[PDB]
Amino acid sequence: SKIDFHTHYLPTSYVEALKRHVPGDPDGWPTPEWTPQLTLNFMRDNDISYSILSLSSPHVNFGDKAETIRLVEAANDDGKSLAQQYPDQLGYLASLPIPYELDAVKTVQQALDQDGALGVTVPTNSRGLYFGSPVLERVYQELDARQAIVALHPNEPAILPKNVDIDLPVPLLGFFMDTTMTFINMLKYHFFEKYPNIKVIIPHAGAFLGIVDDRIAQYAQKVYQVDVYDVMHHVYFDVAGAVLPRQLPTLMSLAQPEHLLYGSDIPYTPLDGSRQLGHALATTDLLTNEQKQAIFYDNAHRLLTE
Amino acid sequence: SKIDFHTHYLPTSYVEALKRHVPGDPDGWPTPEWTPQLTLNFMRDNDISYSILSLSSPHVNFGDKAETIRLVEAANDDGKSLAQQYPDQLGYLASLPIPYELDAVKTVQQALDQDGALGVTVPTNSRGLYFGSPVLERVYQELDARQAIVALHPNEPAILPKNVDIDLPVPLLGFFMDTTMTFINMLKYHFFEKYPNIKVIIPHAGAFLGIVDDRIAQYAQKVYQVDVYDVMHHVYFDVAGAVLPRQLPTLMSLAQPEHLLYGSDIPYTPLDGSRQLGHALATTDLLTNEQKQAIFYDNAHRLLTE
Amino acid sequence: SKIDFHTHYLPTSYVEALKRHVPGDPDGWPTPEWTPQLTLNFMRDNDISYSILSLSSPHVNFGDKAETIRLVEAANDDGKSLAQQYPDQLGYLASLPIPYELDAVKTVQQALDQDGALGVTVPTNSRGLYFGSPVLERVYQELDARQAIVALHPNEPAILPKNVDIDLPVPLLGFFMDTTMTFINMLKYHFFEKYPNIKVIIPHAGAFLGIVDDRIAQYAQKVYQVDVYDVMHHVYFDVAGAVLPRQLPTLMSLAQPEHLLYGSDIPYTPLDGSRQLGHALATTDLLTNEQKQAIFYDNAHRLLTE
Amino acid sequence: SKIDFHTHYLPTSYVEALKRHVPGDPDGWPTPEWTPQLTLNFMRDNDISYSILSLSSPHVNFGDKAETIRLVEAANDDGKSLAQQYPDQLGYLASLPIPYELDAVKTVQQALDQDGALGVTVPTNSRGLYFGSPVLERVYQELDARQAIVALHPNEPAILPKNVDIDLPVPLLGFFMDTTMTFINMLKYHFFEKYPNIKVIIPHAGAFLGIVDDRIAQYAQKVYQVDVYDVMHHVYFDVAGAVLPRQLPTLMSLAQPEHLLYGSDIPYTPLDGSRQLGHALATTDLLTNEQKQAIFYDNAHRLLTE
Ligand SMILES: [Mn+2]
Ligand SMILES: [Mn+2]
Ligand SMILES: [Mn+2]
Ligand SMILES: [Mn+2]
Structure with missing residues (x-):
């Protein structure tokens, strides 16, 4: 069986808050039942x-x-x-x-x-406040002291050019740009260096990290005094989204094999599409049986039993 | 020998204009001599x-x-x-x-x-006007009638969140986000469908296209009535930047082999670094001798003789 | 009788376009029937x-x-x-x-x-292109050649701070900021100097011009080579909105008496509220009977018969 | 003699921070010695x-x-x-x-x-966090408990349209827009209702409040449950800037006579220009000798001895 590390729920008060404060569909993506x-x-x-x-x-x-x-x-x-x-x-x-x-x-x-949470989930940015911001230091300290699991979830970027990609749903490109920007923000603030005990889960196979790391590696080493490659080994990743046939393979040359976690992203991703995505992970020729086993269960299980 | 399709020059009036209108270093990257x-x-x-x-x-x-x-x-x-x-x-x-x-x-x-240009170069966005915008239709028509080569060059995104990646040079992540956003903007406006004769060169191995295509493929097919995969075969790409060992390999499963062009990006990329990048392309195990030959000379040569 | 120089209509195609492209109420103000x-x-x-x-x-x-x-x-x-x-x-x-x-x-x-228009109406900014921009020079030339009446109408500012005045309807503060920014933009580009024949009507009693003029007077004289006070005598102003008891009186120390035009702004401003605003202009002690007559009819009439 | 409630100083560390983090002249206005x-x-x-x-x-x-x-x-x-x-x-x-x-x-x-401060000075917005934001509630409570004087000082608006008023110094229009947006933000969050003991000084004669108040009065009453006119009587105003002959006079029909404070704004405003602005307040026919005495000394003195 599999363990899903990226699946959602929508409290009634949360659904009422969306209708009340957000005109049209949130993130240009209709709210799912x-x-x-x-x-x-x-x-x-x-x-x-x-x-x-x-x-x-x-x-x-x-x-x-x-x-x-x-x-x-x-x-x-x-x-x-x-x-x-x-x-x-x-x-x-x-x-x-x-x-x-x-x-x-x-x-x-x-x-x-006291309330049995397995960890926390945090937005890449909340109305402009990007995770990694020193505005939340005390929050990081409380999380690090508990070796907590911290799963980032992309939100629409605080601000974007208005005369480009007009009406393109935010999850298609915005989410990735935000997760990428946040990861880098965390490197700039030495987040992984200062809170080495936190287990950060970066969604959607690391967004654009598989391509920008190599591009920023130098700057990050010289100006942030951080080795982006070591960090990629240190953090975790869920694999929701169109990770095949290019995204996941690229990520695996950067990520640690035991740090890859399965994710469906339901119900925002239609259940049928999610089923198809999970079936792809099960039958692809890009993954060994051992890797499929790790991604679907072992990795999450190890992480949860710790 | 090689043919460089991404190399720059700086007219004196252009250098004076930068000092006059841009405070500090342009794009957070010091202007090169x-x-x-x-x-x-x-x-x-x-x-x-x-x-x-x-x-x-x-x-x-x-x-x-x-x-x-x-x-x-x-x-x-x-x-x-x-x-x-x-x-x-x-x-x-x-x-x-x-x-x-x-x-x-x-x-x-x-x-x-009349002035012997081999084609044109255009910014992904000029102070907010992103290429692909119907504001420039007549420009596209003049270019298409001449089967012109159109090389996009990334510019700082029109607008970005201000409290994230503070002071991160624009070329490290902004350029890629802009080239990516522009490509998609062109799909939304049926650019390649309406101007099939233009030869578009997308810089830096296609920025983030190697990862988002698979994610937007569906939306693009349903809403734009465009097959992103066909388009990736239709356009060209230069290979400036840290294309190895992940970016170029991913791009090659999407791009046509004859459409990959070498680029150094001097003098914005220090000459020494550019030499090292070009040496990498020559000695890597990720490319066959035929591919190295195509990228360094044949592809450009074919394109120029047409 | 009065002549209304700021009153609106809504074509059915325009209404359908608003529902189709704008989520919620446009400008945070519900579209009127x-x-x-x-x-x-x-x-x-x-x-x-x-x-x-x-x-x-x-x-x-x-x-x-x-x-x-x-x-x-x-x-x-x-x-x-x-x-x-x-x-x-x-x-x-x-x-x-x-x-x-x-x-x-x-x-x-x-x-x-040939279509019998008494002149044109233009947005302070259309998705980011502010009036006065040299992108529209040819448009200005065609308008100046006909000594055309050009009425500016405020639109939501291209972009604004995200975490301030949250949910404040755009017409309450945004419109004014935009009209104000646009007027100065026109100063910067020597609009009134280059197109002296155009008769520009600035809505809502000049928005914030009554207060900023004295602040920018020096800069505009030194850097734009323009005398803001002469320009205030040259353009026109409608008086829709809450012009009493402060706004209109301030504007009259800068505007020419014959260049003040009445405006109701229906149906965006509720009909009862507009009737009350008109009644206030009629009974106020801040205007002489001659000024009330000029604002309500004479000024418009003179401009129309010209 | 006069009491100056809007005058500045520049610590050496602050000056070094400006050179190090801000390219060019801060706010488009050259840092004064x-x-x-x-x-x-x-x-x-x-x-x-x-x-x-x-x-x-x-x-x-x-x-x-x-x-x-x-x-x-x-x-x-x-x-x-x-x-x-x-x-x-x-x-x-x-x-x-x-x-x-x-x-x-x-x-x-x-x-x-314990450090002898006469009160505090705060930015209308600090990189996007506008005063009045509930993010600072605990700060307000500590200030209200001490019936502290809180002087707002305008900063460049978090974000503004890119293609308008290009290169217009921030203090000329930006500062006013920010002070104005901040005041309303404070209305929205019932700041004056919740922290009645704080004595808020709004700079530059209330920026645009003299004109927008009448426009938002209705909305503020209905949606914020606040009477803007009562608030205008409750707060204070310094009178630095080009307050004559229009701004200050308008403000006096809304502000309390005893709540008007003199301000020079040196050294950002050239010393000669400030001396001239002060001389104008002294010789203007728009103020009675009693008002000149109150603005220059009595009001400040009463507030300080309290
Ligand atoms: Mn999700
Ligand atoms: Mn380049
Ligand atoms: Mn109107
Ligand atoms: Mn000041």
């Missing part, structure tokens, strides 16, 4: 024995602090409630009330120490 | 028998139309003058007075029909 | 004998050139058709297919030379 | 008996937290050291390490409770 039953049924039909639920983007920062704290709490309560309802099928990563540092520090401690 | 002799000497020391000179970025659109037209003309006159001075070593691609459509139409006709 | 009868009945109920209709913002530039040209033509045909159906009650200002210079040049000649 | 003697000699030559020094913009947030905290501490030590060296001529407002909430909370307590 969802119920625990949808995920469970998908797990049954695709031999997934365990899913680590996480709140997707847009992040719940709409400009109202009390609202953001309320949404994050509701979302975490749902995650926790589902973990207690299906202890063998569902687990969850806690969302944080970013950009509110002290409040996020409080959520980290509470979600990890 | 240059003289024809620098390029010629570099060609001698690296067995390059022919170079196709082109004006790099930033584009010469500073908000003053008459100035832009004056700079573009001066630049083209320099290119032409060098072609007549060293008919066997130097050739040139004309710059255009974008965003001024009718004026650019006039430059295209004049540079190609 | 409209038919020719609503304007006409408003005119009878408010002693308005003549209205010069114009298309409001957002401008019809959605990224599709053919569509922009089609929408503009449909809007001008409607304006023309209304002037022919109600010669004594309705007139109109033609819209222009900006940012397409050559096409706009064509619309100006046609609109003014 | 300064020593304590320049301010003091200006005071003797212009009948100023007391100046409340403050750090001008750009704010010291360059992306490095430790550096921001270090720069703020160096600036406050200088301010404190000047107040101790010239108890009768110089006082100071402390800067805050915004956007670091907890750290700023610390600076407020220390600055006001």
Whole structure:
């Protein structure tokens, strides 16, 4: 069976917040319907024995602090409630009330120490505040002290040129640009050097890292005093998206084999498309049987048992 | 010997315009010194028998139309003058007075029909106007009627988040994001379908195309009614930059073998670094002798003799 | 009776374009319902004998050139058709297919030379191209040759800070910032100096000009070689909006008495609110009866008979 | 004698930070030279008996937290050291390490409770975080508990349209747009309602408030549940800049007579230009002798002795 490290859920209060604050479709991508039953049924039909639920983007920062704290709490309560309802099928990563540092520090401690979260999920940027920002140092310290799993999830870039790619859904190119920019932001701030105990999961096979690393390697070594290649060995990656036949293969010459995790990205990625993507990973000639076994189960299992 | 399809020159008026309008280093990258002799000497020391000179970025659109037209003309006159001075070593691609459509139409006709340009070079975006924009249709029509070579050159993206990758030179990540966004912009506007005779050269081994194509293939097929894979076979690519060991190999499963062109990117890329990059292409185990021969000379030669 | 120089209409194709391209309420302001009868009945109920209709913002530039040209033509045909159906009650200002210079040049000649337009209306900025930009020189020349009336209409600023005034409707502060930025842009490019024959109507009592003029006066004189105070005497101003008791009075110490035009801004401003604004201009102690007569009728009439 | 509530100083570390992080002239305005003697000699030559020094913009947030905290501490030590060296001529407002909430909370307590600060000065926005943002609630609470004076100082707007007013110095229009956006932001978050004890000084005669208030009055009442006119009576205003003959007079129909404070804005505004602006306030026919006395001394004095 497989363990899904990139699968989502949508609390009712979160769905109401989207309709209330976002005109049209969020990220130029229509909000998908969802119920625990949808995920469970998908797990049954695709031999997934365990899913680590996480709140997707847009992040719940709409400009109202009390609202953001309320949404994050509701979302975490749902995650926790589902973990207690299906202890063998569902687990969850806690969302944080970013950009509110002290409040996020409080959520980290509470979600990890008492509410059974397996770790946390954080937006590449929340209305402009990109992860890696020293505005959240105390949050990093609380996460590092707990050797926590930190899964990044791409959000629409804070700002982009308006007269280009007009109406191109944000997930198609924006998400990748943001994840890439965030990774680099983390290198600039010595994140992996200062918080070596955190286990960072970079989604969608590392976005554009497989191409820019080689291009920034020099600058990063000279100006950031960081070896991008060592970092690529240190972090983790989920493999949601069109990772075949080019993206994953390129990533494997940079990533550590034990650090690759399977992900479906349901329900934002239509269930059928997700099934097809997972079937591709199972039958491709680009992966050995050992690698398929690691990506689908062993890697996640090792990570979770630690 | 090799033919360089991505090498630059800097007219004195262009250097004066940069100091006058751009504070600090352009694109967060210090302006390099240059003289024809620098390029010629570099060609001698690296067995390059022919170079196709082109004006790099930033584009010469500073908000003053008459100035832009004056700079573009001066630049083209320099290119032409060098072609007549060293008919066997130097050739040139004309710059255009974008965003001024009718004026650019006039430059295209004049540079190609009477001043010996081998084609044109255009910015991915000129102060926000991204290539592919219907604002320049008449320019495309004049270029298509002449089966012209059109080389894109990345410019700093019109706008980006300000609190991320602070002070990261633009060429390291911005250039790639822009070239990628522009390519997609061209797909949205059916550029290759409407102007099938133009020979578009996409720089730096296609930036991020090797990773996003697979991700947008579906949307592009359904909404743009375009097959991104056919397009990748139709266009050309230069191979300047850290194309090894991941970028070029990925691109070769998408690009046509005869459409890959060598490029050094001097003098913006230090001459020594450029020499090292070219030496890598010559000794790598990732390319057959036939491929090295095609990339370094045959492909460009075929393209130029047409 | 009064003459209304700032009143709007909404072609059905324009309304369908808004629903199709703009998510939610355009400019954060709900699109109003409209038919020719609503304007006409408003005119009878408010002693308005003549209205010069114009298309409001957002401008019809959605990224599709053919569509922009089609929408503009449909809007001008409607304006023309209304002037022919109600010669004594309705007139109109033609819209222009900006940012397409050559096409706009064509619309100006046609609109003014044969379609009966009383002049043109233009957006302070169309997706980033601000009026005054040399990208439209040929358009200015065609307008100056006809001593045309050019009425600016504010649009949402191209871009603004993301985390401030969240959800504040655009017309409340954005429109003013845009009109203000556009006027200065026109100073910078010597618009009034180069096209003295054009009669420019700046909406909403000059937005912030009443306050910034004194601040930029020096710079404009030294760097633009322009006397802002002379320009304020040269252009025109409609007085739609909350012009009393502060805005209009300030503007009158800078504007010429004969260059002040009445405006209601229906139907974007609720009809009852517009009736109240008009009633206030009629009964205020801040204006002499002569000024009320000039603003409501004489100034417009003189400009129209010219 | 007069009391100056808008005058600046430049710590050496701040000057070095500007050269190191800002290319060209900050805010498009050349950094002025300064020593304590320049301010003091200006005071003797212009009948100023007391100046409340403050750090001008750009704010010291360059992306490095430790550096921001270090720069703020160096600036406050200088301010404190000047107040101790010239108890009768110089006082100071402390800067805050915004956007670091907890750290700023610390600076407020220390600055006001033991370092002799007369209050604090804050940027309308620090790299995108606009004052009034709930990200700084704890900072407001610490300030309200001390009935602290909080002086806003405009900074370049986070982002603006790229192709308009090209090269127009930021202080000429940008500063005003920012102060204006910030004031409304504060309305939106019920700042004055929640922190009634803070005495907010809005610079440059309220920027554009004199004109927008009447336009947003309705929306602010209905959506923010705030009466903008009551707020205008509640806050304070310095009168640096070209306040005559239009700006200041408009502001006086909204502001409380006792809440108007004199300001020179040296050394950013050339000393001769500031002397002329002060002389104009002294000889203008737009103010009674009582108002001139209040603006120049009484109002400040009453606020300081409180
Ligand atoms: Mn996802
Ligand atoms: Mn180049
Ligand atoms: Mn209007
Ligand atoms: Mn100041």
